[PDB]
Design a protein around this ligand. Structure first.
Ligand SMILES: [Ca+2]
Ligand SMILES: [Ca+2]
Ligand SMILES: [Ca+2]
Lengths: 312, 302
């Protein structure tokens, strides 16, 4: 009974002070899925300094300056998105949690997306020059097409609609970074930068769970709403995704057209847009033509993360 | 410089949207201290499952059910404070960061204080009955003296003053939990629950850095203020600490009721109150007599 006549501290801080606060109870758990997720993400802890990025130097050096600039720029753009999710997106989910363990899981997510951003830094430190690193930061700041994407999602985190925030949260690991992740998988399919792709697979091992978990929590909340409100939220999800696809296409054409990779990158992106919708409980409208990924690239995408790079 | 004509995402989200956003730059950093702290806390990653708490069963069984109730209550009280810090306190610090790396470090802090709270659950699962666990949760909810402490500090996290929020964020790891931490060290000094004390030491290894780091960042910000505004902040700190010491004493006298540990626990608490003030750049007013800790208890800090 104590649980039903008390609130978690975050509920007390922001929503309701009619009752006293309860400490987190890990001994009687409301949702077994939370313990499962907690155990999986904590057991998957890793740091980028355990992966030997120096072994990419031979294949890195065979790439010309334009290819090296593209990689640096693409990765710095991905770093921006992780900075958004670490410092705003994931932490904004904590107060809207259904369960106590979920509050701690989103804290873990925010930290681990921080590590993802840190790992690009370790790649740049090993492979890139000081001038390449600085140019890419300049390029990210001045790229309106790049900037438009996080600019569209951030307002949902700072506003007071929890479901819209949760959708925006899941749209980051579930969709937005895949246009960029195409490049390292394109490269490693041609034997280029293999140790970098190991870092990308570790990042993806986390982001796949982040997307699933937010989608899972989204479905639980919207299931309680009226059919009218469910229909309103479905409309919002497709409207937002349609907008984000439009912005993503413009960014990826700008990023990849000179290398001839934009159409493949967009199909790679739309494949994951379908998976994003599936993880929110909706059907994907995209055709097999629209979501076609080349076998060699999909092999790099779906390859298992190496457990030798784990912390323990 | 791209940096001087852009903002971090969190600055964009909450403060200023006039300029475009910059990705975190780990290849050129503003404050070398952030790298040192980041490296230390990440390398110190631990989970409670890797301590063999089951080896405390013999000494747990040597303790009567009044002592077992005290331990469960004390730790569930500490769990509440960690829950406040993980879910509100540390994450509130992110948007008030001086540097990009600090934003990510506070994300680590919130996660790790989460792990601290989780480790008490591991101890309870290993040693306590379900009814012992539930009684302690009831007791925490209904204890007005316990509740007064987080209730006094939470407003600073939800309010618009970054320095007052920072002071509150330092006061929990730097002061409030030490009254509870006295118990396991008192016990392990007498050979009771040695493996539990290893979890407590892993928690403290984090919390000491958390208190240092928040104190360090507070000092950098307050140094930029005018002497009058610096004096005003110093006055706020000593006044707040005075109130929190008052509430802690009342709580600890209640908590240790029947055991005779409250005076020693309060001295142990005030020792850390002095260290809290030192981490904020102020001097400790507390006497040697007021902060006296027995050698055997102090030995368990290490
Ligand atoms: Ca093409
Ligand atoms: Ca048991
Ligand atoms: Ca005494």
């Amino acid at each position: 009974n104590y649980y039903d006549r008390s609130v978690s501290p975050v509920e007390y801080a922001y929503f309701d002070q009619s009752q006293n606060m309860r400490a987190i109870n890990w001994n009687k758990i409301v949702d077994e899925k939370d313990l499962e997720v907690w155990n999986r993400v904590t057991q998957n802890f890793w740091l980028p300094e355990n992966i030997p990025v120096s072994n990419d130097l031979p294949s890195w050096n065979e790439l010309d300056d334009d290819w090296q600039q593209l990689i640096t720029r693409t990765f710095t753009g991905l770093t921006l998105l992780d900075t958004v999710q670490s410092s705003i997106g994931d932490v904004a989910q904590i107060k809207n949690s259904l369960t106590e363990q979920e509050q701690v899981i989103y804290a873990n997510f925010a930290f681990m997306v921080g590590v993802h951003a840190r790992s690009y830094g370790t790649i740049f430190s090993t492979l890139c020059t000081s001038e390449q690193i600085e140019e890419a930061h300049e390029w990210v700041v001045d790229n309106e097409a790049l900037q438009a994407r996080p600019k569209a999602l951030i307002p949902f985190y700072t506003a007071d609609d929890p479901l819209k925030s949760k959708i925006a949260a899941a749209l980051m690991p579930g969709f937005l970074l895949y246009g960029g992740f195409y490049l390292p998988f394109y490269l490693s399919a041609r034997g280029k930068l293999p140790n970098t792709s190991d870092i990308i697979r570790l990042i993806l091992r986390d982001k796949v769970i982040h997307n699933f978990y937010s989608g899972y929590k989204y479905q639980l909340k919207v299931a309680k709403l009226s059919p009218e409100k469910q229909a309103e939220m479905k409309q919002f999800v497709f409207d937002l995704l349609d907008k984000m696809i439009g912005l993503e296409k413009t960014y990826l054409h700008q990023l990849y057209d000179g290398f001839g990779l934009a159409d493949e990158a967009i199909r790679f992106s739309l494949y994951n847009a379908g998976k994003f919708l599936q993880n929110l409980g909706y059907e994907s409208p995209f055709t097999k033509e629209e979501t076609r990924i080349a076998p060699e690239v999909f092999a790099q995408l779906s390859a298992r993360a190496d457990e030798n790079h784990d912390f323990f």
